[PDB]
Design a binder for this molecule. Structure first.
Ligand code: HEM
Length: 387
């Protein structure tokens, strides 16, 4: 019996070896029920994952987009939250949230990323020692999401800390409790923005009278989860790359390496979103297997981002890797709405660390989170030297 939803398979970097085998073969593997309530098929190659997530492909996210959910066991947020909705409800929310996460919105948030990195490099610029998976990685995305939601500056530090714990190590607050506390604050913020609307995500969501208080809350949560759960590990990955890849930090400083090109390589290299699930809407043949309607199909994104048919020497971090057609942000109609924001966050992080820090050195091997939703760092012990 095979179960690819087992988190123990991905606790070590050997997950890449398992993925490499399945990606090069372009395999369709069936997983038996266990972590999944009904089981699921899986694709691994770049071409197979792109075909599953295609706009014209008869698959849906309305029942959920992660292992644990299917047609018979649907996501409770299904049809209400953007990432688990389809058709006009999905199009509406993507239209309402869209411009607040656009390239233009990302550019005005670039200053905050610089300030937040600078404030971090005020206590870690010492010799030893700091974890990069905490108080470095989660700090930047949390600050950005705060300004998107339009939270008062007075409450930012409270919200940063709760966001940090909500998507970090599972084990006196619990990540689930911290998540709840944010949603409790969200409800209080929703109430205040009903009386006095401004220029923020909460205000934009509440002005639409067709959306209920539950719809506003769930889509605020989509931005909270979306902007934090994955992004933190990409930032930690950027620090990890600067610590391991020789000459990279210097190359960014002098300008021999292109900043936007390395951002795309960090994205491909880290691939924080480990999987995306889809449910078939009609009878379809994927790869070479005939699947009925209501069948769960899963695309393993880090496997696709290291597919040798698409990426030459995929295990090496290449600062000038071109072309780089990674699907770290997924593909098709649900392509990450905050992709420009994720790119601007990484861009500024790599810039400021090249400007202020002379050398970043790794203390010991990183630990990984016991999870399947995210390819995440549990810890990254590093030494910072600058000034
Ligand atoms: C490098 C970090 C990030 C990664 C790896 C990532 C990954 C993804 C992926 C793979 C999806 C598609 C899910 C699916 O296909 O079912 C997605 C959707 C989404 N993400 Fe991101 N994301 C990142 C950063 C962000 C940021 C910064 C934001 C904004 C604050 C954000 C907000 C969203 C939203 C709102 C959706 C739903 C889009 C839709 O359903 O149309 N994400 N993300």
């Amino acid at each position: 019996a095979v179960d690819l939803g087992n988190p123990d398979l991905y606790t070590t970097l050997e997950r890449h070896a398992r993925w490499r085998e399945l990606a090069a073969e372009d395999a369709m593997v069936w997983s038996d029920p266990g972590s999944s309530p009904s089981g699921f098929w899986s694709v691994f190659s770049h071409r197979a994952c792109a075909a599953v997530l295609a706009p014209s492909a008869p698959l849906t996210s309305e029942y959920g987009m992660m292992i644990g959910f299917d047609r018979d066991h649907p996501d409770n947020s299904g049809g209400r939250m953007m990432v688990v909705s389809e058709h006009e409800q999905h199009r509406k929310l993507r239209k309402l949230v869209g411009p607040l996460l656009s390239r233009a919105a990302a550019r005005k948030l670039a200053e905050r990323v610089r300030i937040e990195v600078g404030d971090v490099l005020g206590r870690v610029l010492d010799g030893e020692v700091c974890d990069a998976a905490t108080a470095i990685g989660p700090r930047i995305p949390a600050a950005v999401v705060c300004e998107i939601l339009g939270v008062p500056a007075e409450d930012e530090d409270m919200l940063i800390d709760l966001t940090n714990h909500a998507f970090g190590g599972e084990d006196g607050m619990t990540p689930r409790q911290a998540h709840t506390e944010i949603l409790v604050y969200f409800d209080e913020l929703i109430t205040a923005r009903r009386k006095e609307p401004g220029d923020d995500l909460v205000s934009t969501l509440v002005t639409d009278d067709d959306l209920t208080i539950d719809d506003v809350l769930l889509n605020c949560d989509n931005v909270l989860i979306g902007g934090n759960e994955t992004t933190r590990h990409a930032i930690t990955g950027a620090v990890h790359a600067l610590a391991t890849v020789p000459g990279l930090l210097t190359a960014l400083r002098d300008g021999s390496a292109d900043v936007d090109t390395v951002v795309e390589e960090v994205l491909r290299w880290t691939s924080p979103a480990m999987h995306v699930l889809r449910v078939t809407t009609a009878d379809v043949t994927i790869n070479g297997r005939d699947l009925p309607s209501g069948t769960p199909v899963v695309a393993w994104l880090p496997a696709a981002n290291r597919d040798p048919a698409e990426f030459d020497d995929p295990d090496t971090f290449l600062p000038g890797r071109k072309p780089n057609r990674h699907i770290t942000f997924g593909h098709g109609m649900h392509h990450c709405l905050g992709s420009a924001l994720a790119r601007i966050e990484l861009s500024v992080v790599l810039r400021v660390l090249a400007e202020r820090v002379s050398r970043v050195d790794l203390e010991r091997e990183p630990a990984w989170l016991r999870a399947i939703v995210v390819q995440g760092y549990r810890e990254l012990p590093v030494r910072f030297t600058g000034r």
